[PDB]
Design a protein around this ligand. Sequence first.
Ligand code: LU8
Ligand code: LU8
Ligand code: LU8
Ligand code: LU8
Lengths: 283, 292
Amino acid sequence: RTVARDITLLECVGKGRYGEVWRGSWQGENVAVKIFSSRDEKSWFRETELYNTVMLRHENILGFIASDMTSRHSSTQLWLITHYHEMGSLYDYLQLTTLDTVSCLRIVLSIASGLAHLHIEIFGGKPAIAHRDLKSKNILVKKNGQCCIADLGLAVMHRVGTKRYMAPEVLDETIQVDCFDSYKRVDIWAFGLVLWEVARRMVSNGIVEDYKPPFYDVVPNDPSFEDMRKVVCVDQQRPNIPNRWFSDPTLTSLAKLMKECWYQNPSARLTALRIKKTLTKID
Amino acid sequence: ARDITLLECVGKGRYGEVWRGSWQGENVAVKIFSSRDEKSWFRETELYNTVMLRHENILGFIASDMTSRHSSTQLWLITHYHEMGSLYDYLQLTTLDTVSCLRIVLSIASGLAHLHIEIFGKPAIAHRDLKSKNILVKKNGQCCIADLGLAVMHSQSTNQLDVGNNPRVGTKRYMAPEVLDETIQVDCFDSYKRVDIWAFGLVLWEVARRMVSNGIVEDYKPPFYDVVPNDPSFEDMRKVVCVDQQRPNIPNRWFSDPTLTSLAKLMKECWYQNPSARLTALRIKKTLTKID
Ligand SMILES: COc1cc(-c2cncc(-c3ccc(C4CCN(C)CC4)cc3)c2C)cc(OC)c1OC
Ligand SMILES: COc1cc(-c2cncc(-c3ccc(C4CCN(C)CC4)cc3)c2C)cc(OC)c1OC
Ligand SMILES: COc1cc(-c2cncc(-c3ccc(C4CCN(C)CC4)cc3)c2C)cc(OC)c1OC
Ligand SMILES: COc1cc(-c2cncc(-c3ccc(C4CCN(C)CC4)cc3)c2C)cc(OC)c1OC
């Protein structure tokens, strides 16, 4: 039989220290191709090792197609091939879109769904998985209004995370590194920041906030580890809840939820399953 | 030009299957792993990531893939294709002269020394499943070592030992005494090199039996053919190697031939029960370079 392996790389949709992501074509179908930098080869290895352990399949997890290693004259080429989401990342989408109540809830409950699926151990099944780099750039928007979580290059099963989204126990180096629940609690912190980024773009009473990243008002671009530790750990700052949210029942309920993702004490934070239940009772 | 055509199956077993395929007008070998051996696929992929692993006497890598749709996963390794097959196949079919016998065993020693020696790059690498089915014969009369799914890596420069996560064990017939009695020092890189040396000695014996001297040759037999049941168990091998202290017998006709006399001495220095007494791969390579 013929094994068709050619992918046509059509347009670059992302470039960074990780490498590049391309829209590509296989057998008539869009795929996304992440080409890893030498700098970030361990992210390809970790994603590949995880998928070789458990073939994750969930509507709110970016869909795996292939991991490819190709020998070159002087180097090794590493590609991760996934489903392609033409609407791009949640970060991208929130810049130039506002949300209504139904679309806001649909986004955040789909993220919570993906995250709870990662976190839960299923016997028979899947190991429990913590993401360790959850952020709005690592979430893609689907045409049906749900999102999916991407990038398992730092995932742990039972490179450092993006500093802006690091939990206080990561910044003050008190995290219990031998305890798997610690890593779930770091994801919940980051989930709460993403919830804030999305909620700001939900219209109520004719008002909306501009898109801003978490802590935009207290740290520089590319904040240092120290910049973040002083905000999050020493001063114990948290993102602002605008007054206008308290006129809207949905945003009032979301503010309460995000507060319960941001407790200094990691063990006080909500679980992804409790977040899902709370979101199903909103509206 | 990434497409491959699968043309014929050249092997199926517990490992999965190997195909001869076509890739930009060249023969390639395509191994499709069994799901039972998914950890070997990943380990072999980690090993072939190393650009300085490339060597005349190591099977050349082209690509590695993991593919999936729904709940089905396939695991692929694409390599150079050697139509003469494995050393195990070749030795069934042909006898050797002195020049061919030494060319084969020096090439294997050259591959093994290349694996074992760190380049300051390529880590030091112990194979852990050396056997005649894991050695391919090339049209230039040299061989190459295949199957890095059980390999261990070490760097003395950073003091790192990477034993991997693979419950697979070596081929039972070729297991060293410290593997069969499970006293091997698992956190010691030198322990794994010494396991490879034991297995190399057995492969030397398999090859030397097929070298003609004075009009005499032995039939091809696998190591310990005479003393264990067909399809020997772990305990069968432990009995002969560890309890009975058996080693392959040296046919007395070898002692009339200087080459085979030197090879018998060399394979005995691979077979000490004390692993630390065994020769190194570099010493074997140097000794075979001097033997004629
Ligand atoms: C190696 O590399 C790539 C391969 C492919 C690809 C292309 N056609 C067919 C296939 C295929 C799938 C599955 C089987 C099964 C059939 C049932 N049988 C019982 C076991 C085996 C055979 C063939 C694949 C996997 C795509 C790629 O990219 C999209 C690849 O590169 C990453
Ligand atoms: C975070 O991580 C990964 C993401 C993806 C991924 C999957 N679908 C679509 C995309 C994408 C498409 C299109 C735009 C833009 C481009 C300009 N204009 C058209 C607006 C839209 C952006 C983004 C991506 C980047 C793939 C990955 O791996 C293969 C990722 O890594 C795991
Ligand atoms: C990697 O990705 C894609 C792969 C394929 C594809 C190509 N050939 C064959 C297959 C296939 C056939 C049959 C089995 C099974 C069936 C049941 N039992 C007998 C076990 C064996 C598995 C696999 C596939 C899935 C298509 C895709 O898209 C349409 C892929 O997505 C990009
Ligand atoms: C050991 O391991 C791997 C080996 C190979 C490989 C490469 N060239 C040629 C072969 C071959 C071809 C043909 C025969 C013949 C021998 C006589 N008669 C019995 C019919 C069959 C045997 C052997 C193989 C098996 C590829 C691999 O991966 C792609 C291997 O895995 C790393």
